[PDB]
Amino acid sequence: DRLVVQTSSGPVRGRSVTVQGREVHVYTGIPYAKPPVEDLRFRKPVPAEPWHGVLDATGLSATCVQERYEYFPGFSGEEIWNPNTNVSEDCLYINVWAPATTNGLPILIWIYGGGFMTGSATLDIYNADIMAAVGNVIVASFQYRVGAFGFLHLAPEMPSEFAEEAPGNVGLWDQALAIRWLKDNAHAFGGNPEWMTLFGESAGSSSVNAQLMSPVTRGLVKRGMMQSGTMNAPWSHMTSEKAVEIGKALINDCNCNASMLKTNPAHVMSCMRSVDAKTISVQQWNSYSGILSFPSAPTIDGAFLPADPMTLMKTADLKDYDILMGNVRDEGTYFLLYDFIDYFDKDDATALPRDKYLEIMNNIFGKATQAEREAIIFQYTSWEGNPGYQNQQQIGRAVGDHFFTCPTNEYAQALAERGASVHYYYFTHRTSTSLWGEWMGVLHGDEIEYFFGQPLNNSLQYRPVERELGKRMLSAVIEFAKTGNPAQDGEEWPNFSKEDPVYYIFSTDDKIEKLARGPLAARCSFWNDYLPKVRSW
Amino acid sequence: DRLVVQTSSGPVRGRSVTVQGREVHVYTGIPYAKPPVEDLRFRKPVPAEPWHGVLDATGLSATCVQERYEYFPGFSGEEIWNPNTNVSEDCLYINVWAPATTNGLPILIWIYGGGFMTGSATLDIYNADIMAAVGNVIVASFQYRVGAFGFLHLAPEMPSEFAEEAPGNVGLWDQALAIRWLKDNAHAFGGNPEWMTLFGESAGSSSVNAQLMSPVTRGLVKRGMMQSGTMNAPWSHMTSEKAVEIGKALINDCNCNASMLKTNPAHVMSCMRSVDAKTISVQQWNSYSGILSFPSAPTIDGAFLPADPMTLMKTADLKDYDILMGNVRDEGTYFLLYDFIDYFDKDDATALPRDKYLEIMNNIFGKATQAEREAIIFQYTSWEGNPGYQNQQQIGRAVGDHFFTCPTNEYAQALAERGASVHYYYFTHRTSTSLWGEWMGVLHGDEIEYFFGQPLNNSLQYRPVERELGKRMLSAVIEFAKTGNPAQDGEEWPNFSKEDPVYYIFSTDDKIEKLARGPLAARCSFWNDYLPKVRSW
Ligand SMILES: *[C@@H]1O[C@H](CO)[C@@H](O[C@@H]2O[C@H](CO)[C@@H](O[C@@H]3O[C@H](CO)[C@@H](O)[C@H](O)[C@@H]3O)[C@H](O)[C@H]2NC(C)=O)[C@H](O)[C@H]1NC(C)=O
Ligand SMILES: Ic1cccc(CNc2c3c(nc4ccccc24)CCCC3)c1
Ligand SMILES: Ic1cccc(CNc2c3c(nc4ccccc24)CCCC3)c1
Predict the structure, then answer these.
(1) Half-sphere exposure of A394 (CA within 13 A, CB side)
(2) For residue A92, what is the domain's CATH number?
(3) Which of A527, A529, A530, A535 to mutate to test the interface with B (most CBs of B within 10 A)?
């Protein structure tokens, strides 16, 4: 078959789609690791046993075990992020979209987000059909273990012998393993293996970050696109000691004692591999208190992540790295609606009084000092623009700014200082069909479909300028993948640095100035310059 | 003569002016105290010895001893605030403007400003001709001792016996004495003595404040207009211990030892009364380090000012007090140009770099903690609006806001809470003929002429809307004087309180909303709410 490709591990058969007037060959569900199941739960992934026989790569693969948000039962806007294939631990599968400088096609690799607890390469929104077809590039995506399955971290609690029992970050080992698989097999799909670009969003973006900077993997890929996610972000890294404590709680939470981890770890681990995945899937969430602070995150392990993400950079040079990164306008709105659903509504705005503005602010930042809390509350106090609506708008800004936009900004400046050619974007279009509430603005993740070129899909409802924006945002990705520079011919989009923190604005509004420096600079000046000084007692 | 009026101390003869089509009788230079000279230097004023014979009250009286700012030699804009009659210690004279509810005319009494170091009732700008004529009210002004002459404070350094040797605040005793004189003689000028209104600007405004609230005088006048000056303001009150230290330096500075103040005060005081006034006039300024922190100020004396101005209010009710108060848009520009003339220009704006923005900010607020300095510097950091020009604009705002607008705001809220009917205004018109630099905006004191009705003077150059504004601002004063309420017929101008900090905006722009709450509330929220909390270690 011409839909058959001989991979490193055996022949695979795929589908043929014709989108945007070009043939793509779509291979979905290729095992890249042995199913991380039974004895291999919590462990590093091991390469998949080779096969022979055409492997059916025409259906979607499984979704790694996770829980579905049902805060709005039946609301399409929530469940399009829920798993759309069966959930199972057997989930380590790769997807390749392959069209029908000169030694093969560029390969783009997508890592999804979902806070290291959720997410799946199989979501419609991550369909690489159009990107591959129009970009004329190889696009690949894959599942990686999330939640406690990907991030249970207990090795310090156990003797040397039991290191590989629960080393932590195996979800990042998964990604490492799938990217290795794609390098190995780039040529078999018409792809140039030295021409690879990682890209992702939220936790996927931070994972792009980890894969570029980890000693375990660094050098393999040196060109990445990070959408609203950087490892310095508070939700995207976690100490080993906190990870262990979460792990110890989970072990207890699944009725497995955990106080025997030192005296007899092997038995505690057997117990945890006998637990049904659904039980882990639920009990891991007991350790979630704090908006945007998940129990699973890239963990300082002296291995994949050997130091805290900002002490990594003071010593490694990045002159050969190309980085495209950015943010959406309202990063924090849906996190705030979910974590404070008692206060807020999905569809309409909330006139939030001043005491309940304080109630929420003082909670979100309860772990900062009160000199920070007072400073933050003062920085986000509305005075104009009709109260209440404005207060909700400011708490959203604060969440977005503290958790995504300003960490991204800070990491973008640190990447530029060590030589990386950084390009920064800011996404400010609220899609016309968005059925999230108007007050929620331009949601975290709203940009993913645009960068994938989905507005080019004439079967989904979009306005002509939105299809223009999708064609522009996909083209920024394809040009970044192809040249390390997102800028089109004659389009001005200069490098981002501390000296000139210029970013590109993606909007349908042809009246705005596309290049801007000041507004993000001021927003995040508070978080990245002034607030550190407040923290000095 | 019909220009002759029999006062408490003898007959006085004045002038007849006809302005705005009404006859006014203008008596200038009426002694209200014995010349505070030789033995009476530094002492409380004593009532003037009665005379007989028509006293020539047709010329301007002397100016109390002070120094003239010559920062711009020949610039009319500076020297119209310099003394325009001879400077001398013999200066305690009153002025009455008297036209040609029902028991006499209202009496308005003007107290000039000049930082308790300068100023004179004789300035053209304080001409009450139009106000009296158009308002059809009695207007009075008078000289009061300024500088060390009015405020040398040494009684704590000396035994009980020598209390009256240098009690301090004699300049406020002067004003007390002239207001008493005007009550005594209100009827002789056609004025109703129970119908008196104090009004003033800068230090005069704070003096209006002191005269309304001092136990020495309170009850006499219960209706006042305070323009950019309140006693809580940092430049408008001073402890006794700091006053003594200033006094001790001056005594040393005039070559009189000062370390003998306790062992033999009488000799140290003789020495200081032998010093030429010009020497005191100069050496008192040696104790001026710090913008807006003059060596002379209303001093806590357990007498005229028995406590710190904000601990006074927590115990006295003001239900019968009417207070009209307010601010100009750019309170701090000329103070900043004078104290930082090396940096800035009179006519054109300064592109102030960021390090020199810090140089000035860190100096002006050098005495605040660094947690305040960092907070203030962050609160006034420009990001947009073209740098440099913007930085100068923000340091001006900070000075204006910290030194006048926010203390006034704070005192206005405290006055309303204790029952006073407060009305708040905000003056935002830059006069067309202003030959100060455009960047200096609407200067501190720019409003005085408008409230005096000077734009009604057809011989000075003003635009028609400026004459409208003068006619409106004079009418706010006359209506406030007559009814305790500045509001015209059908004009909405509601009471100012913490609950509803609404103010009236005086502008020639007919496009703005005259009533506003939010913009001052936000400006001063920083100074009056948030910064106090920063001050907590
Ligand atoms: C563009 O947008 C349209 C929707 O407007 C997308 O159409 C969707 O295509 C997928 C796959 O082609 C359909 O899923 C399939 O369903 C059948 C049975 O219903 C199943 O046998 C397949 O294995 C697959 O699961 C989906 O139903 C369809 N939805 C609609 C509303 O048409 C299209 O994929 C988008 N992308 C492009 C590049 O056109
Ligand atoms: I972690 C997390 C916290 C709260 C809600 C969710 C639900 N999943 C969601 C995801 C994304 N966008 C969404 C937009 C609206 C509502 C839910 C979304 C994009 C990437 C991660 C998953 C996940
Ligand atoms: I204290 C002080 C500090 C700096 C400059 C001066 C000069 N005197 C001045 C006064 C007033 N307005 C002015 C406007 C521009 C320039 C100088 C002005 C109004 C009342 C006090 C005196 C006084």
Answers:
(1) 25
(2) 3.40.50.1820
(3) A530
